[PDB]
Design a protein around this ligand. Structure first.
Ligand SMILES: Nc1ncnc2c1ncn2[C@H]1C[C@H](O)[C@@H](COP(=O)(O)O)O1
Ligand SMILES: Nc1ncnc2c1ncn2[C@H]1C[C@H](O)[C@@H](COP(=O)(O)O)O1
Lengths: 520, 61, 61
């Protein structure tokens, strides 16, 4: 693709249409790119004795990058509703990336006024980490994605990565990556950038909730043919009746004693919190009493753990200590914001396959009972994996992460990103972008010294992203209507998912995905 | 006299999908075969009644 | 107006009593609804209207 100055290098493709078996979303946004790090690679690390479990070492690059690992980058609210309310599941298929209508602007502070002018001969550099040789910094819920609202212009994030570290110091096996050591396409105004990607085979997401329960699985009307022991001593308690071994045949009556075929999913107990700031202990325990793990003598918070339900029946006020994902409302400090300023996600559809996050797991025996010894019971707060266990995964939300790169290790278990979504061995590659350095006035005499005098300039253009989604259609013989997402028909102030009096788009609530029901 | 197979629950995750009571765990097991006697109404009224029909001939198969 | 079935009642309901109730003690008014019947023949729900009109004066021979 090569055209002229007064000729656009692309069009605005922002649309979505459905094919009953699949859906194609196209999304275009305007982007702006500054000059990060002053065209310099800078070594970064932790403050000399500021914190210990936060010690780190890495580098900062003059490169920006494109991100669209959020669902609202592609699905308008209305669309998300169509998807959510009609499909057993869904997944990604293809991807088309396009950069175009590029403009390079250089600015000058002459006196007390900034003039901005065109630098037509200036270039910009783009490339894609398709061999995954660069540290994958996406799928970490960072900021700088495409604006949920198409009319919103966004700033392109800067690229930085972390390496291996011993405290604030580094090791010998630490890796330094130069992005100038990658072949990249240079673009002038009227040039453009093309890219296509094909997702791998990754299971459909669960856009459903089970209409049955792991324990309420059998026939309510018939008794089993298996027997269990329910009386150890209790007999005809009158004369000469100390103890006896008695067995009962399973019945719809003994519903939680019947022989079973499957187990609930794994668990890692979280601490229970209440939204009412007075049910809780008068202490500050978000760290000393929260669940966590430690690698190399460094404690890390187990924020979203295994998929566990948020609360039990008849509660809805108790949420796991960070046992779920939380989104911040529009306009809310990054530092200690009120509970009325955030949006907490309820995972109450998986109550049927998974243990509750705050509750125990079950009961294990740990002794050899006899006439001499009384049988001991121990509450299990942590459960690894077991043959027979089944479970559901974390939901995805309109503004949640989509995919995540699966770490290249010797072993994985259930490679589903813990924050939710699609785990990929080879995910959509990273797209790097940066303004090419333009030297300012050079000396008539030759100076070997590092060149530091540059013309200040930023870039702007459009970006387009087209993704094809495969849908799993609903096939239910449920007679009664199912629950659907819907807006309040009530006379309301502002309209949900809209701009306000002074033009600011805002998403009212987090949107789940499990509205339709399937059987176990 | 034990169980033979068992349907594997349609969830996001399983581990070792062998039925815990023993046997063969199947994603798609032998389907359920339903059977029932078709309702045979008894003497109807010469006058039209909208009310739910409840008078049936008792019979087994 | 004589278009429906003389033998069967409708499944639609109309309001035919606004006050008239068990007119004895403490019975001023109440909202009561009756299901259309061959009996309530000119009260039943309808599907069509008669033609337009422009009243003329009446004369006798
Ligand atoms: N998001 C995602 N990506 C890939 N696989 C998933 C995902 N979620 C669940 N699984 C399941 C599907 C396969 O049966 C299994 C492969 O594990 P393996 O370790 O590859 O043998 O992991
Ligand atoms: N009864 C029964 N049915 C199916 N598979 C069984 C059974 N017993 C053991 N396995 C083993 C065989 C496969 O290697 C594995 C597939 O797990 P998956 O979760 O399918 O990846 O589970």
């Amino acid at each position: 693709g090569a055209d002229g100055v007064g000729n656009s290098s692309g069009n605005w493709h922002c649309d979505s249409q459905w094919l009953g078996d699949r859906v194609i979303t196209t999304s275009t946004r305007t982007w702006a790119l500054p000059t990060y790090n002053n065209h310099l690679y800078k070594q970064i690390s932790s403050q000399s004795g500021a914190s210990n479990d936060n010690h780190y070492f890495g580098y900062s690059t003059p490169w920006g990058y494109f991100d669209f690992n959020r669902f609202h980058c592609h699905f308008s609210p209305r669309d998300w509703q169509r998807l959510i309310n009609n499909n057993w599941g869904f997944r990604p298929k293809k991807l088309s990336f396009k950069l175009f209508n590029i403009q390079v602007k250089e600015v000058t502070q002459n006196d007390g006024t900034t003039t901005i002018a065109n630098n037509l001969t200036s270039t910009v550099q783009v490339f894609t980490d398709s061999e995954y040789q660069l540290p994958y910094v996406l799928g970490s819920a960072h900021q700088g994605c495409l604006p949920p609202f198409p009319a919103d212009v966004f700033m392109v994030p800067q690229y930085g990565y972390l390496t291996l570290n011993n405290g604030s110091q580094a090791v010998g096996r630490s890796s330094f990556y130069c992005l100038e050591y990658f072949p990249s396409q240079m673009l002038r105004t009227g040039n453009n950038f093309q890219f296509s990607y094909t997702f791998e085979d990754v299971p459909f997401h669960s856009s459903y909730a089970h209409s049955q329960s792991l324990d309420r699985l059998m026939n309510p009307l018939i008794d089993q043919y298996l027997y269990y022991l329910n009386r150890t001593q209790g007999t005809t308690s009158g004369t000469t009746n100390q103890s006896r071994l008695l067995f009962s045949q399973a019945g719809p009556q003994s519903m939680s004693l019947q022989a079973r075929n499957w187990l609930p999913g794994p668990c890692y107990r979280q601490q229970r919190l209440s939204k009412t700031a007075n049910d809780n202990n008068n202490s500050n325990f978000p760290w000393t009493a929260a669940s966590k793990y430690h690698l190399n003598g460094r404690d890390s918070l187990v924020n979203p753990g295994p998929a566990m339900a948020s609360h039990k029946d008849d509660e809805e006020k108790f949420f796991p200590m960070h046992g779920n994902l939380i989104f911040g409302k529009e306009g809310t400090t990054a530092s200690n914001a009120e509970l009325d300023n955030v949006m907490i996600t309820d995972e109450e559809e998986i109550r049927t396959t998974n243990p509750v996050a705050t509750e125990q797991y079950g009961t294990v025996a740990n002794n050899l009972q006899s006439s001499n010894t009384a049988p001991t019971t121990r509450t299990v707060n942590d459960q690894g994996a077991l043959p027979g266990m089944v479970w559901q995964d974390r939901d995805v939300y309109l503004q949640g992460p989509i995919w995540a790169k699966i770490p290249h290790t010797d072993g994985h278990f259930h490679p589903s990103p813990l924050m939710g979504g699609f785990g990929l061995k080879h995910p959509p590659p990273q797209i790097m972008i940066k303004n090419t350095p333009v030297p300012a006035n050079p000396p008539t005499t030759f100076s070997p010294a590092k060149f530091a005098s540059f013309i200040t300039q930023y870039s702007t253009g459009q970006v387009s992203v087209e993704i094809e989604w495969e849908l799993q259609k609903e096939n239910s013989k449920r007679w009664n209507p199912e629950i659907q997402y819907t807006s309040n028909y009530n006379k309301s102030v502002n309209v949900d998912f809209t701009v306000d009096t002074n033009g600011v788009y805002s998403e009212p609530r987090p949107i789940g995905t499990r509205y339709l029901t399937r059987n176990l």
